[PDB]
């Protein structure tokens, strides 16, 4: 059903892989569609214009040349509506950047180990989730600069956490990593809702107390039975999960037996139910993300030879350009799903417009 035309492409002059791309879904009405790209020590902003024009807006060039940005996530200021961009990578430093000036206005350091993904809470623009090479997830309140919670320990991830996703309402997180496992962490518990509330009440200039972070050691569910390799991308599709490894499939599955409710699932739940698989080829290298559009009506995944697969989630289109031959690391749909951006290993950017 869905068709796209390649209207433009470009290459960033650093020639390093671009690991992340995100459209700003908080962009204002009347303003051009903006997306950010991340790779090497750079964060770059582009505007989408008519006649397929991809206009370079601005760039952040990190002071440390050895920084490798792996992820970016947009949010907005809850009082003014002004957009902000969160970036992080190999250095383990979260940077909150003002996109108008490219000023780093806030930075956070957990233990300083590489951050593989950032995600903002779907209902709270101040709640930032980070997943790290150090096997833990961290939840930050960027309004009060507090570490709300650390998810991990011997019962948490036993290797790098590579991806995570909040559900629709931001009541729970599903995480995944190098340990082959997918873990559930409920954040609508009395303990977590209280912690989030206290994070808002914290002001270090009016007290001598440190802000106490929750140490969440036990996940609400765990499975190692979906994939047989590094699980590098996870996303909620309602109460269901979409996840992939490097085994040439995106698996749609759920914790428990076929008719088990996600909110009745106990931590000891030993079963999983696979609902289906999105099969494809030549996407067996590690660290390849899939994306969905805002409405979760489309699913897109680039492969390691520059093909871009798009599935209709309501019922497969293959987007290919004879000059697009590098690994597509991540894709991003604009909020209205009219544009799909693919970023590559060779620092190239490809613009596909929906017909
Ligand atoms: C684009 O798709 C991603 C999926 C998952 C994911 F974690 C990332 C970010 C990094 C990409 C690079 C990286 C390495 C290098 C040193 C070999 N090693 C780890 N662990 N990474 C992860 C990206």
Q: Give the DSSP letter string of 177-237.
A: ETTS-EEEEES-SHHHHHHHHHHHH--TTS-SSPPPPEEE---SEEE-SS-SS---EEEEE
Contacts 24+ apart (CB under 8 A), 174-179: 174/234, 174/236, 174/241, 174/243, 175/131, 175/137, 175/151, 175/234, 176/231, 176/232, 176/233, 176/234, 176/243, 177/131, 177/135, 177/230, 177/231, 178/230, 178/231, 179/135, 179/224
CA of 70 to the centre of ligand 1 (A): 7
| Beta carbons within 10 angstroms of residue 101's beta carbon | 10
Technique of determination: X-ray
Find out whether the beta carbon of 288 lies less than 6 Å from any atom of ligand 1: yes
Give dist(CA 111, CA 125) in Å, integer: 23
Nearest to 349 by CA among 40, 89, 35: 35
* Residue 233 CA to its chain's centroid (Å): 8
Share of the chain residues as helix, strand and coil, in percent rounded to the nearest 5: 5, 45, 50
Query: Relative to the CA of 131, which ligand 1 atom is closest?
Result: 7
> Which of these, 85, 79, 82, lies nearest to 22 by C-alpha position?
85
- Longest CA pairwise span in the chain (Å): 62
- Listed in sequence order, the residues at least 6 apart from 215 whose beta carbon sits closer than 8 Å to its beta carbon are 149, 150, 153
**Could you give the CA distance from residue 122 to residue 24 in angstroms, rounded to a whole number?**
14
Q: Which helix (H) or strand (E) holds 47?
A: strand 42-48
> Residue whose CA is closest, atom 18 of ligand 1?
287
Degrees to nearest 5, angle at CA 224 with 218 and 225:
135
Tokens read off for 133? 């090479």
Q: How many residues does the chain have?
A: 355
| Helix boundaries (H) for the chain | 190-201
For domain 1-355, the question of CATH label 2.130.10.10 is answered with yes
State how far Cα 285 lies from the chain centre.
18
In the beta sheet, which residues pair with residue 177?
A: 161
> Among 18, 135, 162, 291, which residue has the most ligand 1 atoms within 8 Å of its CB, making it the best to mutate?
162
Residue 5 φ/ψ, nearest 5 degrees: -120, 135
Is the CB of 19 within 6 Å of ligand 1? Answer: yes
Distance 243 CA to ligand 1 centre (A): 16
Task: Of 118, 84, 119, 117, give the one whose Cα is nearest residue 102.
Answer: 84
Contacts 24+ apart (CB under 8 A), 194-202: 195/148, 195/149, 196/124, 196/127, 196/141, 196/148, 199/141, 199/144, 199/146, 199/148, 200/141, 200/143, 200/144, 202/141, 202/144, 202/146
Query: Which residues are bridge partners to 291 per DSSP?
Result: 300
In Å, what is the CA distance from 160 to each residue of 34, 180, 194, 229?
31, 10, 28, 13
The kind and range of the H/E element at 331 are strand 328-333
Distance CA(60)–CA(114), nearest Å, equals 19
CB atoms within 10 A of CB 297: 15
Q: Is 38 in the pocket of ligand 1 (CB under 6 A)?
A: no
Q: Which of 78, 109, 82, 79 has the alpha carbon at shortest distance from 98? A: 82
Q: Are 166 and 138 in contact, with CB atoms under 8 Å apart?
A: no
Cβ–ligand 1 distance for 265 under 6 Å, the answer no
CA of 45 to the centre of ligand 1 (A): 21
Whose CA is closest to atom 15 on ligand 1? 287
β-strands 20-23, 54-61 pairing = unpaired
Gap from CA of 138 to ligand 1 centroid (Å): 18
CA–CA distance from 18 to each of 69, 182, 269 (Å)? 9, 26, 38
Is any atom of ligand 1 closer than 6 Å to the C-beta of 135?
no
Burial class (CB in 10 A: 0-12, 13-18, 19+), 277: middle
C-alpha to C-alpha distance for 62 and 343, rounded to whole angstroms = 20
What CA–CA distance (Å, rounded) separates 23 from 47?
10
CB distance 232 to ligand 1 below 6 Å: yes
Q: How many CB atoms lie within 10 A of CB 175?
A: 27
Q: Is the CB of 230 under 6 A from ligand 1?
A: no
**Of 314, 309, 264, residue with least CA distance to 290:** 309
Torsion angle of alpha carbons 311, 312, 316, 317, nearest 10°?
A: -90
Ligand 1, from 70, 134, 180: best to mutate by most atoms within 8 Å of Cβ? 70
Q: Sheet containing 214-216: give its strands across.
A: 115-120, 127-132, 137-141, 146-151, 214-216
The set of long-range contacts for 252-255, using a CB threshold of 8 Å and a minimum separation of 24, is 252/276, 252/277, 252/278, 253/226, 255/184, 255/221, 255/223
CA atoms of 296 and 339, how far apart (whole Å): 15
Q: What does the buried/exposed string (b/e) look like for 227-251 if buried means 16 or more CB atoms within 10 Å of the residue's CB?
A: beebbbbbbbbeeebbbbbbbebbb
* Cβ of residue 243 lying under 6 Å from some atom of ligand 1: no
Question: For residues 61 and 54, what is the distance between their CA atoms, to the nearest angstrom?
Answer: 20
Q: Is the dihedral of CA 28, 97, 151, 79 positive or negative?
A: negative
| CB-count burial class (<10 Å; 0-12, 13-18, 19+) for 24 | buried
User: What's the CA gap between 81 and 101, in Å, rounded?
Assistant: 16
Residues near 54 by beta carbon (within 8 Å), at least 6 away in sequence: 8, 10, 46, 47, 48, 349, 351
Strand order in the sheet with 328-333: 4-11, 348-354, 339-344, 328-333
Name 273's Cβ contacts closer than 8 Å, sequence gap at least 6. Answer: 253, 254, 256, 257, 258, 260
């Amino acid at each position: 059903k869905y068709s796209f035309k390649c209207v433009n492409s470009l290459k960033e002059d650093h020639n390093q892989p671009l690991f992340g791309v995100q459209f700003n879904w908080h962009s204002k009405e009347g303003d051009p569609l903006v997306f950010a790209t991340v790779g090497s020590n750079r964060v770059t902003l582009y505007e989408c214009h008519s006649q397929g024009e991809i206009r370079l807006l601005q760039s952040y060039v990190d002071a440390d040349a050895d920084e490798n940005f792996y992820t970016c996530a947009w949010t907005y200021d809850s009082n003014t509506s002004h957009p902000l961009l969160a970036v992080a990578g190999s250095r383990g430093i979260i940077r909150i950047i003002n996109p108008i000036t490219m000023q780093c206005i806030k930075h956070y350091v957990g233990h300083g180990n590489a951050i593989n993904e950032l995600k903002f809470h779907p209902r709270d623009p101040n709640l930032l989730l980070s997943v790290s090479k150090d096997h833990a997830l961290r939840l930050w309140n960027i309004q009060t600069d507090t570490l709300v919670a650390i998810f991990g320990g011997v019962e948490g991830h036993r290797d790098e956490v590579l991806s995570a996703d909040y559900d629709l309402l931001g009541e729970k997180i599903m995480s995944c990593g190098m340990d082959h496992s997918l873990k559930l962490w409920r954040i609508n518990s009395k303990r977590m809702m209280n912690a989030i509330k206290e994070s808002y009440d914290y002001n270090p200039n009016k007290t001598n107390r440190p802000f106490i972070s929750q140490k969440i050691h036990f996940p609400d569910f765990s499975t190692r039975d979906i994939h047989r390799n590094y699980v590098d991308c996870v996303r909620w599709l309602g109460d269901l999960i979409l996840s992939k490894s490097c085994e040439n499939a995106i698996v749609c599955w759920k914790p428990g037996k076929m008719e088990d409710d996600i909110d009745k699932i106990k931590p000891s739940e030993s079963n999983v139910t696979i609902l289906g698989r999105f099969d494809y080829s030549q996407c067996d290298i590690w660290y390849m993300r899939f994306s969905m559009d805002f409405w979760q009506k489309m699913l897109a995944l680039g492969n390691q030879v520059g093909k871009l697969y798009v599935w209709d989630l309501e019922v497969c289109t293959t987007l290919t350009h004879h000059k697009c031959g590098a690994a597509i690391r991540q894709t991003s749909f604009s909020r209205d799903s009219s544009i799909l951006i693919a970023v590559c290993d060779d620092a190239s950017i490809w613009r596909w417009d929906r017909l």
